[PDB]
Symmetry: none
């Protein structure tokens, strides 16, 4: 039975979620031993417990250790049943992470499924639920996976209140995704999302983006105050071979110019290499291509997350990933 | 002015120290912004302060954030002055860390120096101060760097009271270190250090080593009780093209065979690949070879620390590292 070390790599968290999906995809039970060893909060936390309850439900699992402070977990899956699921995280809970725990398993469920989660849609430090729909959902569709995520209500950290819902269909046949050169840029678009925040913050954040980029469109998107106070700014880089979109969630004490300046940092950083995908989309492509048994993509630099995702994957599956950091770009490929 | 993110990679600590040495090597001031964001203890801690006080003494620096809970720091170094320094960390302080923050700078000092540090020499969780003298000092010498570390008194975690002192000499000219194949073993040697522990733990420990290895020498090293109760076991792997040494510090509630077995796991893990160097020595060679402007070495797998150390180095210096993960061995090279 598979044993994983929680302090390994970046140090738990992602290890738990990649394990869950894999352990269900595969059926191999596993045991994480030092969950969040050194993190401020030592082990399983409400979100992880929710990640775990959702997992131990989509697949009738048997778990040992699912307690709020646990640094040990034994998870024995069952059959990933398809169906209408509804999970509810708190406020600090990112629907994104529940969904990226459970959806992979559902790719192999006995039938189509719908997952609806509640909680935070946009968190300052983390990826927004939009990345799912506007960025990876398409690479996935290309790897033969079929998912459709709709953002139904936004929950801006620290408010909570968001509602995201994904429609899945058991993967029929897998395809090999072959990314490399980003290709020539086709168009860049900036977009700001205000909910309870004034139209002078959007304009300011937009401007900054227009400051270094030639946006084909500058869009300001207004959501009901109901959606609490929130501001999220994004720039999309629809290159030829790929379409990426970067985000930066405005913080409490962070200025329109600072928030926009973070995003500009990233965007330039991506653009500064020929690499088709960003560090984060890379982190997400590791699993699906593994299931697919082949495929590759280029990414500027191997990140510490990549490294651990590739570990867990290879810990549950008969795959070999190869990273060839040649000329400022890294070619991540399967075997 | 260089800005560094403290939650980046493994998550601060090493970023802080690699940033200091570089900042003084180079002169470029910088700013760490989230020192130990998620860790149990959120930012600058006594040890780090010491790292920072020692740094901001070797080079007459200007610091902003040097407070016991700080998650932010601004460091403006000056001229690295050579001379006889004496730093004193606590008990939980590892001389090794202070020494690896300061010593790189001192290779570039206006004159020869001596650095004496007090505190913990042998910590269960971390590398012993012996690793410096018996393992990296030689690779360094080959790089053209000239340093000599004598352990003068041991301080076993949690006691403290250890004393390590290093003599350095400004680097005249640098060399290219080209490592790769470990070559054939040339001899193994086990060693047990007892300070206030009985000569039955040493034997038991040695036995286990002799249990899977063919030790050319089985040395038991007895320290005055003065040195507190301590037990450290090590095994040296003198291969053709390199000599490595692995250590495991016997813990409070850890038995002779458990201690011995940890060491055997590692030694084997090492031995299981053609890679000249171990994860840790790899981490340490990043910087020197970068100052060297070329060089390489092979390591089994790229670690997360490797990733981040490479990051910081590349942030302060005009160097490109290349990782090529080919055949279970990764080749780290410079450009």
């Amino acid at each position: 039975m598979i044993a994983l070390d929680g302090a390994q790599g970046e140090g738990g968290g992602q290890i738990l979620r990649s394990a869950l999906s894999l352990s269900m995809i595969t059926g191999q039970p596993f045991t994480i031993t030092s969950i969040r060893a050194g993190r401020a909060k030592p082990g399983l936390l409400r979100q992880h417990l929710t990640a775990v309850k959702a997992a131990t439900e989509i697949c009738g699992a048997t778990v040992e250790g699912a307690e709020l402070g646990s640094q040990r977990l034994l998870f024995r899956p069952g059959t990933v049943r398809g169906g209408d699921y509804r999970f509810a995280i708190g406020s600090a809970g990112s629907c994104t992470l529940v969904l990226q725990t459970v959806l992979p398993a559902l790719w192999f469920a006995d039938g189509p499924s719908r997952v609806e989660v509640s909680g935070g849609t946009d968190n300052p430090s983390a990826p927004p639920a939009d990345f799912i729909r506007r960025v990876l959902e398409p690479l996935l569709a290309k790897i033969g996976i079929h998912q459709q995520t709709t953002l139904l209500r936004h929950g801006f950290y620290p408010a909570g209140g968001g509602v995201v819902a994904t429609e899945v269909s058991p993967v029929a046949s897998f395809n090999t995704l072959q990314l490399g050169e980003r290709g020539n840029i086709v168009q860049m678009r900036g977009e700001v999302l205000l909910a309870g925040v004034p139209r002078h913050v959007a304009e300011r954040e937009i401007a900054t983006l227009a400051g270094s980029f030639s946006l084909h469109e500058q869009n300001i998107h207004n959501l009901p105050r109901d959606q609490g106070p929130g501001n999220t700014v994004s720039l999309e880089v629809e290159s030829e071979n790929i379409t990426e979109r970067f985000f930066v969630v405005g913080e409490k004490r962070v200025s329109a110019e600072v928030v926009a300046a973070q995003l500009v940092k990233e965007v330039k950083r991506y653009l500064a290499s020929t690499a088709a995908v960003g560090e984060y989309l890379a982190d997400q492509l590791v699993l699906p291509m593994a299931l697919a048994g082949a495929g590759e993509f280029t990414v500027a630099h191997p990140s510490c997350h990549l490294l651990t995702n590739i570990a867990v994957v290879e810990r549950f599956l008969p795959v070999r990933f190869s990273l060839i950091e040649t000329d400022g770009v890294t070619r991540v490929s399967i075997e």
